[PDB]
Structures are given as C-alpha cells and as structure tokens.
Design a protein around this ligand. Structure first.
Ligand code: HEM
Ligand code: HEM
Ligand code: HEM
Ligand SMILES: [K+]
Ligand SMILES: [K+]
Ligand code: NA
Ligand code: NA
Ligand code: NA
Ligand code: NA
Ligand code: NA
Ligand code: NA
Ligand code: NA
Lengths: 157, 157, 156, 156, 156, 156
C-alpha cells in the first residue's frame, strides 16, 4: 500500500459523502420532474452528475494509492417533502461535505500528499459553488415569493 | 397512491438490485483500468452506465405510481480480487437479478400493470444480454487461456 | 497649453462622476448576480462598461488639451440595500451627473470649445437614456408589483 | 455569515490594491498613447484590463463569503512623468501588491479557506508575470538605450 | 536578487533530476525502437519530451528569480539491459525524484513562494502519472506474461 | 557486433558535442527570453532543437552498429554573460564540433562505413550553416552597433 493510510481513510470518507449526494440529488431531480418543475429537475440532475464525476476521481486516486474504495457503506439520505425542504436538505449535506473536505486537506498537507490535496481542493471549489447556488435559491424564494419561484422553475431553459 | 402496492414493492426491489450493480460494475471497471486492462475497464463502465439508466427509469415509474423510490438500502457488493472472480461475481449478481425480474413480471401481469411489465421486460432483455457477454468471457478464458485473454483486453477498441 | 483651464476643470468633474458610477454600477451588478437576479446583474454590468467608455474618452480629451486627468479623487458611492434602493440610488447619481454635464456644455460653448461640447453632448444623451431605463424600472415595480418585477429579472 | 472576518479584510485589501492599479495603468496607457508610444499604450491597457478582471473575482468571492466589498477607498496613485518613471512606479506598486497577497494566503491557509487561497494564488501568478514584464522593460532600456527603447514602442 | 536562495537550490535539484530523466528515457526509447518494440519506444519518447518541457519551465522560473540554472551537472543514468530492467530503472528514478519534489514544496511553502510551489505541484502530478504507468506495466508483465507483454508492444 | 569500434568511438564523440550544444543553446535561448530579446531567444531555441535532432540520429546509428550510446558524459558548457559573449561562445563550440566531425569522416572513409560518413556530412553541413549564422551576427554588431543589434532582436 503506497499511499498514507489516513489519507486513504479521508478519501474514502469524502467518497462516502459523494455517494450520499449522488442518490439524494438524483431522487430530488426526479421528484421535481414528476411535479412538473422541470428547470429544478434539470439543474439537480446536473448536480448529481457532477458528484458522480467527483466520486470517479476519488475512486481512481484511492486505487492508485493501493487503497480499497468503499462503495458499500451508504450514509443517510435526507429527502425533502417540498422544494424548500429539498433545497435546505441539499444545503445541510453540502455544509457537512465541506467540513470533511477541509479536514482531509489538512491531513494531506501534513503528510505531503500534494496531489491528493489538489484533487480535494478542486472538489471543494465545486461544492462551494453548489452552496452558492443553494443559498441563492432559498434567498430567491424570499425575494419573489414561493409561488413565483416555483413558477419560474416549471419550464426548462 | 395510484399504483398497486406490491408492484411498487417489486419495482423497489429491482431498483435495489440495479443500485448494487451500478456500484459493483463501476468499481470493477476502475480496478481493470488501474491494472491496465483498459478494454475490460471500458466495457464494464458501459455496463455500469446501462444499470444507471435502468435505475432512472424505475425511479420515474415509481414516482408516477405515487410510490417512494428507495435509494437508501444498498445490498451486498461482491468485489472480485482478479478478473475471473470479478466476471463470475457479476454473473452471480445478474442471475439473482433476472430471478427477481421474472417474479416482478408475474405480479404485474396478475394485477394488469402492463406498462410496468413492459418496462421490466425491457430491463430483463438487457440483463440477459449481459449474461450472454459474461458467459462468453468466461468461456474465452478457457478457449484462449487466461494470459491471452487478459492480453486481448489491455488496449481499447 | 492649448486647453481652456476651466474646460479642463469641467471635464475632470465629469470624469469624477463617471468614476463614481463605474464602481457603484459594478458593485450593484455583482450584488444582483449574488442574489440570483441575473437579468438585473447583466444590465447593470453593461451600464458600468458604458461609463468606463465615457471615462476613457474624457481622459483622452483632457490629455489632448494638455490637462492632467484626475483618477485619484473618488466621490461618494451610495450602495443600496435592496433592488428598489439600488435603482433609486443610480437615478439620484444620474440626475447629479446630467446637471454637471449641462453646466460643462454651457462653458464649452462660451469659450468656443465645440469639440469638447460635442463629446459632452454624446455622454449626456447616454446618461439620459440611463435615466429613461431607471424611471421605467421603478415604474414597472409599481405596475407589476415588486415580487413579479424581481421574478422577471431572475433569468437572463 | 460564512466567511472568516479577517479573510474578508485581506480580500478587501487586495481589492483595494487592484483598484489603484486599474486607474494607474489606465492613465499610464492613455499617456503613452497621447505621446505616440502606441505599443506601450496597448500593453498597459491590457494590464489595466487584467486588474479589472482580478477585482471582479475578488468582489464576487467577498459577496459569496457574505462580506461587503469596498470600492470606496482609493489609495495613492503614483503617476510617472516619463516612461522610465511610469514603469518603475508600476513595479513599485506590484511589489507592494505581492507582499499583501502573500500575507493574505498565509491567513487563508491558517483558517482553511482553501478556495480563497487558490484565487489569491492565481492573482499572484499574474502579478509576478507583470513584475517579469516590468523588470524586462527596465533592463531593455539599459541594454538598447532609452531612445531605441522608445522607438521600438512607437508602432503597435 | 528577488528569489530565496534555498528555493533556487531546490529548483536546480529538481532540474537536475529532470535532466537525468530526459536522457535516460530518450535512450530507453531508442533502444526499444532498435528492438522493434515500437509501442514502448513511442511511449518512452513522449515521457522524455514531457521531462524536457518540465525542465524548460524550471529554467524559466530560476531565471525569473535571478538564479543561475545548472545544466552542467548531469547525475547518474541507470540504463537497463532488457525491458523489465528499463521499466524498473525508470520507476527507481521517479520514486527518488518525487521525494525531492515534496521536500522542495515544503520549503517553498515555508518562505511563501506560492508560485514556485504551484509549478512544482504541477510537475509532481505529472511524475505520479508516470509512476502509475510504470507500476501498471510491471503488473501487466505479471498478469499476461513477459512474451505476451512484449508482443503487445511491437506495433504502435 | 557489426560496427567498427573506432567508428562508434567517433560517433559517441560527436554525440557528446551535440549534448553540450543542446544545453548551452537552450540556456542561452532562455537567457535571451528573460532579457526580452525574444528574436534571439527564438532563433537559439531552434538551434538547440536542431542539435537534439542530430543527437537522435547519432543514437539510432550507434545502436544499429551495436554500440552503446553515451548520454552520461557531458562536457563543459561555456555560458556567456552578455549577447556578444554568448554568440562567441556558441561559435567557439561549433568550431570544435566541425573539427571533430572532419576527423570522424576521415575514419569512416578509411574503414568503408559510407552510411555513417553520409550522416556525419549532413550534420557537418548544418553546423557550418550555424557558423555562417553566428559569424553574420557578430558582423552585424560591428556594422549596426550593439544597441541597434539588440533592438532588432527584441520582437519576434
Ligand atoms: C458510485 C456511484 C456513481 C458513480 C461513480 C457514477 C458515475 C457516473 C459517470 C462518470 C457518468 C458520466 C457522466 C459524464 O461524463 O457526463 C454517469 C452518468 C450517469 N449516471 Fe451515474 N454514477 C453513480 C451513481 C449513479 C446513480 C445511483 C444513478 C441513478 C439512480 C446515476 C445516474 C446516472 C445517469 C442517468 C447518467 C447519464 C447516463 C447517460 O449518458 O444517458 N448514477 N455516472
Ligand atoms: C471597480 C472597478 C472596475 C472593474 C471591476 C472593472 C471591470 C471590467 C471588466 C470585467 C471588463 C471586461 C474585461 C474583459 O472581459 O475583457 C472591463 C472592461 C473595460 N474597462 Fe473596466 N472595470 C473597472 C474600472 C474601470 C475604469 C475606472 C476604467 C477607465 C477609466 C475602465 C475601463 C475599461 C474599458 C475601456 C473596458 C473595455 C470596454 C469595451 O469592451 O469596449 N474600467 N472592466
Ligand atoms: C539527449 C538529449 C535530448 C534529445 C535527444 C532530445 C530530443 C528531442 C526531439 C527529437 C525533440 C522533437 C524535435 C522535433 O521533432 O521538432 C525535442 C523537443 C524538445 N526538447 Fe529535446 N532533447 C534532448 C534534451 C533536451 C533538453 C536538455 C532540453 C531543455 C533543457 C530540451 C527541450 C526541448 C523542448 C522544450 C522541446 C519541444 C517539446 C514540445 O514543445 O513538444 N530537450 N527534443
Ligand atoms: K408571476
Ligand atoms: K499471444
Ligand atoms: Na405528478
Ligand atoms: Na449566493
Ligand atoms: Na454467450
Ligand atoms: Na421611461
Ligand atoms: Na524578466
Ligand atoms: Na496499477
Ligand atoms: Na556569414
């Protein structure tokens, strides 16, 4: 095993978080499509795809380091019952994810695994972009009203 | 809830099987790429993508029937340690999957859910194609020898 | 030095107004984008760019007239806290800007600097178009309601 | 408010440096064009545009972190009176800017704001490329002589 | 001079490793071509080219920092006598060379040379990709057998 | 082994000369680029690339003849401190290189290795073209003066 054992543990923890997000965002996407809120459904689908790509890169890095990627343990999905709950639940997940990313980066730096650190910083930038999106949507609900906000997400771009 | 309760249970069971296959095939794909067996890695990636598409269609059908798609419960991945074990483990998973598909189809027919039956028959045809592929690969190992078989899967098409 | 000294003072005053407007509109643009009101953010960015182009022409004219362009003194930015305040603040700024432009044109005419007058008249036409836009947006808020007005500016 | 308060102070300090550089380089550009040294004018315009783009990214990051971008305080422009002074003034400004960038990156690292650190590192790479350019121009003046150096920058 | 003296020493040490790798990989490439293992010859040629490009970037950074690039001291090449030995020798070089890159990055971080650190991190990612390639080839020899492995590298 | 042992010694001597020139010309190129003499930098880069191609052909020929190419022993680089020293150092190196080429050709002819002779004659033609270029550049410094000569090599 060529990589640092705790680095591999951290990468598997980030991978676990991405696996939760893949499933939660994919279900939320399809719930929004089922309700006819196709613009939200499409955007949330692309969020799910982006998490899938991050998970791929984490799996490839873990194998290069001769660790074992853990795709078996799936943590808790928090599926909302309406749009505001779904957005907030995504946001709560992202805030936990960025906490775990920052701890992983600290450890990669300490053991000089600079390539793993760069991979995680790239993922972190993407997750912060997702936080930006989510906070913006919740703010729009307040500025334009829920009924208008949902109306604006019926039809795709 | 507009759909038959047991139909929705069956669709969630098939969905559960697809979720196992997504992860097992994706990891097997990336293990083969890590070993430099890129033709196997590419083929197994496309198998994983195909299971993702089946899972999407099952989720959409469950929501239309006003059921709750279960993306939370992930069953047992059986990750092989070498090519022959990985192929056999995929094959064992597919044989369980087709058993469950046939039971689901029997029940859809009994309660006259002909659209759900057609969706499952489409998935079943794809899974039998995957069995065809897997049985063929294991037979090739015997006909050309393991070392030649692996050699033939180093470079992509 | 070929230029009239008071013409150069006037041109530097107009330049100072443009420099305030560049920064106020740019910040308002990025606030609207942060809030997800991308159509307002995009329009306000283009207003900021237009002020940048006016400032460029003023700098070039001042240098031709052998004056010293003043980019050092930045007057008061009035940043609003919500859409209605941001639009009204831009409008208040534009009304001050057009007052100064008219006084500058009067002086250019008196000392026969007709090319500077023509430059300032082109800038004034642009600033009056911006007043038109701002008064129209504030009127639309009254006609369609605030929530609908904001909704119509979410998407570009 | 998600952002670290001292990170936002640092980002506003870097923003303040960019705002000085935007105006100093833009004026230097238009001075060089007025003098007929169009190749210097064009290059310096592009330096001003690059600083504008950095300021934009800083404003956007500050707003994401729920801070208040400061476009109101404009520090000291040091406008040169001839080409050699203008280049050295830009270089003095860039050396101050890189010192502040390094101090900002240290603090971002300490509080684990790695995305802000990455933004500042990209800006720092751009500012060090500008130092490279400036040191090269000042060296060329010594190697080819001032008159030849200016001659080579008449035409674009 | 602007650069930290130990940073420049570290960059010259990395440059020295790249210069060994250029020549070792180029000779290994031409040995594989002479033996008719053209797929290995072509891949190894591209590894040598990639090291040449890294060397270029390091030379440019050393000169910007006002250090003296050292292309005179060439360290020890380890030339294999068959395919297995050549791949092992490349891997030995890469493992020793990535250790030096990590030590250089630690020092850049300590003295706040973040641009040098970023350059070395880009090179390090490339060298780890080469380690990935080399370990994979040695594993394929085990999995498919040496004769099949070489057969698969006859044709481009 | 098919090759004449002294032919292989001569080919390895010529290869050693090319390896010196690759590194000397590459560093001179990057020094000229650092100084903003980009036309000299580009031309010198191309000279380095041409020596790389000659080295490749020599390596291939040695391996065909069942000799061992020597990429380990790197002779003395003579790096100039300014343009006139750099050009003269390149010229001195080329004059040594052509002396060795002629002695290698004499020996190839004596032992009837006409294909090695032809390869060396093709290299010699390229090195004489480089001598032509270098002598011309030193002559231009005298004819147009150093400051004008350097000015003419600022822009590509
Ligand atoms: C281990 C977890 C997963 C990984 C690593 C993963 C990876 C990927 C990747 C790399 C792609 C290609 C994206 C692109 O290049 O644009 C993809 C596509 C896709 N994935 Fe996933 N995925 C995972 C789980 C899932 C799940 C659980 C679902 C749905 C329930 C899903 C649904 C999809 C769909 C619908 C596509 C697009 C298929 C198409 O091209 O038609 N994925 N996935
Ligand atoms: C807060 C301060 C400023 C910011 C954030 C800013 C930002 C920008 C940005 C992002 C662009 C587009 C650049 C590109 O994408 O190529 C731009 C264009 C430009 N800016 Fe600024 N700018 C600022 C101040 C100024 C000032 C004070 C002036 C002149 C006195 C100026 C002159 C220009 C010009 C001439 C253009 C090109 C317009 C065109 O496309 O015709 N900027 N600015
Ligand atoms: C044994 C020594 C070397 C050999 C045989 C060699 C050979 C080559 C060859 C054949 C090329 C392709 C040229 C073409 O076809 O146009 C090349 C490219 C190049 N070489 Fe070398 N080289 C050597 C050492 C070096 C060194 C020491 C440096 C710099 C320190 C260097 C820098 C470059 C660069 C920058 C390129 C262009 C690569 C690109 O942009 O794709 N090389 N070399
Ligand atoms: K509405
Ligand atoms: K075979
Ligand atoms: Na519905
Ligand atoms: Na936001
Ligand atoms: Na079959
Ligand atoms: Na109006
Ligand atoms: Na320089
Ligand atoms: Na491997
Ligand atoms: Na000549």
């Amino acid at each position: 095993m060529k990589g640092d054992k705790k680095v591999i543990q951290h990468l598997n923890k980030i991978l676990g978080n991405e696996l939760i997000a893949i499933n939660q965002y994919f279900l939320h996407s399809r719930m929004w499509n089922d309700w006819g809120l196709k613009r939200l459904g499409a955007h949330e689908y692309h969020e799910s795809i982006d998490e899938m790509k991050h998970a791929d890169k984490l799996i490839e890095r873990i194998l290069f380091l001769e660790g074992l990627p853990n795709l078996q343990d799936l943590g808790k999905l928090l599926i909302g019952e309406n749009t505001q709950e779904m957005l907030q639940s995504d946001l709560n997940l992202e805030l936990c994810a960025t906490k775990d990313l920052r701890e992983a980066i600290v450890h990669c730096e300490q053991v000089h695994d600079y390539v793993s650190r760069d991979l995680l910083k790239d993922i972190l930038e993407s997750e912060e972009e997702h936080i930006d999106y989510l906070e913006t949507q919740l703010g729009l609900i307040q500025k334009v009203g829920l009924e208008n906000y949902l109306q604006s997400h019926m039809h795709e771009d």
